[PDB]
Design a protein around this ligand. Structure first.
Ligand SMILES: [Mg+2]
Ligand SMILES: [Mg+2]
Ligand SMILES: [Mg+2]
Ligand SMILES: [Mg+2]
Lengths: 441, 441
């Protein structure tokens, strides 16, 4: 099943590659997995992060010095770095399903790749993180990471193959398990550090191989959007927990966010439940052929609803709240973004395979996606509401200050904020919510 | 007390810097903490690894875009990157023990540094991982990471101040706690992954912030010198555990290795005990004024003694065993190296402040230290005995094959290997074993 899906994946990628080579007048693409490099003045290596364009073809993510030659017609060729040394642990020559559709060739020495490459290299496009290596290998200067080919392929990354979707559902499983374990850790009164430990234990991940840094935010930290630190002692009293964490399977990411209240009978808990319901309703409105921006704006309308309902903003209609941008400081980020091999996946602004860029509207400058919904797309939906003094301050001084319930805002600050993130897949007649299909409350 | 020590530290570094600047004809050093950089084609950042030369002055290890300006006479100036935006964690400048000896100035934008630096930059030497940024700031290309100054400073990093020693002792405490918890995990039959969890829990480290990747090796994996993988299921039969792991405090590293046998009554357990005792005896022989190579060779003699005692190598004297290099494949690495801000600390081969280089002897090409011991040096002592087929097998094709007890070697291979590592401080008339002072058995 997964194997046959992978045969389709290879066929799709071969077609895209063939079209790209035809358009940009190239013979083939040489895709480099990457190389190790050390910290300044030290021999301490940075962790290896594989070229996304490399793992786009094959599930090999932990091996540098690998090389993929593709022409869209012949069987893809993979030179797989296989050093023989007693120092390091070395990955064996892979023989999994994918090796049936990809010709795997052992590469004992990294500098042995040059003699194995095609004789004529003048029309080969190199894609990889080491341009100097490409130049050494006889790749023409302009064929080193050519932006036209890269943009083309990125545009087509927007549309996931069935194999990719299967991989992403598998990542969803791991992330869900992690989130449940983390919630249990929170309920037990554990610190952010220990909660993180519980998440990693449940997922089988290390902090060095999660698709992105975990956000384990207790209380006020929930209002901190890029919170990546971990307190080693639990707060004096538990109030709230925002967890933005995910997982990875065959290079494909899940990226989930859940928010919990320590108590269930306060304003904050009610607000969390409301954000949940609004998120689900928004998703229920989603369909192909509609701009993603529409859904961003839509959630700002829902924010206006919640602000009015909870008496956070008073003496103003929801419509006027949106018109005057009062909802702006409460969700100062976008409703979400494409998801795939990368967490913030490529082509979020790209309208065609020629690289046409459509920026976010000035009113919502941090929106990461301006794409028309089409079947095959995988997108995050991550609405939130936060109470951030630096953003609220100018409002307190301005003409709309009287509309803000500063007392209640102060009362909500110690709870930080709320975000609820699912990952969905656009289909012809519906939207598949992978996260909720796994019943993550 | 740490404040007073730090004041002394500042005085020391000031004088070193003054002398270096006078010698290599510069007015000041501009030392850059570093910059974030992302994965190829992604917005996923690599973990931040501070410039060792930067944390050499101040205990700031997690903040990019910081700049130290030092002339060796006036109070050190530190522009501390302190951005004001509703993302990540917002807080004021540090007011810790070190902020009275250094002038700390908030830097809200990374590109604002250039207008805050002295106008005359023709004689300012840049030290940092971003030469391009130095060029942008008008630093002469020949003054970007100047070899003379860097080598000089590296040479003097060999001699730790009292502040540095204190920090290293704290790191020792952390690491010792980790090793104890890890041994306990091992005895309980836990997988490498769970043992690593236990280590991280006891030290309070993350995999992303350990000074070097943990080596958690069960059974045969102990024969793999750089084993940084983790099995998630415990092996069928527990036989051995080699743990090479450490900790960091104020940017200063501890690096410890311990080896345990599942059973206490077999040959392997006895060999582990013997290696431990021989390590301790070697350390008991250590003296200032003596070459480190002497101690490397000495431990090869001790290895010869053990191999003879255990009937692993037969019918050859210890002296002849060393002369013919039969002990070679049993410890294919150095006896140790300088330790400090970096794990493999600097100036290991550097004989003077002019950068004179003394290579390891050809017989022991992987020895990382050729220094004469002097008071204030911190060194690792990490002897080991391993059973590595790729290194042992060729001896069967040679004239000394008859001296190898291949049967016993075959019996010992399932246990992998043994390494016992302590971190020691050289003093005038004694050697301080920080690790054993903490009673890590
Ligand atoms: Mg997220
Ligand atoms: Mg997201
Ligand atoms: Mg060491
Ligand atoms: Mg070590």
């Amino acid at each position: 099943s997964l194997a046959s899906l992978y045969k389709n994946h290879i066929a799709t990628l071969q077609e895209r590659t063939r079209d790209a080579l035809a358009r940009f007048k190239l013979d083939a693409l040489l895709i480099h997995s990457g190389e190790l490099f050390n910290v300044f003045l030290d021999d301490h290596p940075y962790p290896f992060k594989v070229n996304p364009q490399f793992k786009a073809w094959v599930p090999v993510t932990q091996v540098p010095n690998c090389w993929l030659l593709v022409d869209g017609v012949n069987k893809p060729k993979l030179w797989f770095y296989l050093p023989v040394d007693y120092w390091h642990n070395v990955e064996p020559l892979p023989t999994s399903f994918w090796t049936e559709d990809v010709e795997v060739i052992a590469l004992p020495k990294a500098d042995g790749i040059g003699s194995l490459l095609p004789a004529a290299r003048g029309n080969i496009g190199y894609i990889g993180p080491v341009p100097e290596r490409a130049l050494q290998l006889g790749i023409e200067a302009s064929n080193i990471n050519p932006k036209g080919v890269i943009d083309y392929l990125h545009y087509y990354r927007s549309f996931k193959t069935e194999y990719e979707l299967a991989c992403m559902r598998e990542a969803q499983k791991m992330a869900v398990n992690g989130h449940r374990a983390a919630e249990e850790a929170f309920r037990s009164g554990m610190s952010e550090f220990d909660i993180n430990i519980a998440y990693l234990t449940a997922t089988g991940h290390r902090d060095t191989d999660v698709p992105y840094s975990n956000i384990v935010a207790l209380n006020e930290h929930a209002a901190v959007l890029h919170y990546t630190k971990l307190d080693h002692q639990a707060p004096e009293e538990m109030r709230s927990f925002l967890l933005d964490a995910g997982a990875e399977y065959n290079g494909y990411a899940a990226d989930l966010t859940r928010t919990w209240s320590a108590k269930s009978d306060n304003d904050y808990a009610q607000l969390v439940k409301d954000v949940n319901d609004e998120q689900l309703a928004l998703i229920a409105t989603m369909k192909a052929g509609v701009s993603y921006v529409d859904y961003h704006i839509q959630f700002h309308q829902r924010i206006a609803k919640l602000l009015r309902k909870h008496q956070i903003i008073t003496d103003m209609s929801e419509e006027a709240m949106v018109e005057n941008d009062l909802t702006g400081p409460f969700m100062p980020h976008g409703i979400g973004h494409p998801l795939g091999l990368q967490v913030h996946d490529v082509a979020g602004f790209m309208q065609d395979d020629s690289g046409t860029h459509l920026a976010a509207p000035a009113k919502y400058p941090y929106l990461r996606c301006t794409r028309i919904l089409q079947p095959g797309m995988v997108l995050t939906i991550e609405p939130g509401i936060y109470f951030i003094e630096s953003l609220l301050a100018p409002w307190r001084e301005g003409q709309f200050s009287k509309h803000f319930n500063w007392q209640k805002i102060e009362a909500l600050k110690p709870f930080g904020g709320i975000r609820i993130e699912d990952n969905v897949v656009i289909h012809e007649n519906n939207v598949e919510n992978m996260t909720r299909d796994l019943k993550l409350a």
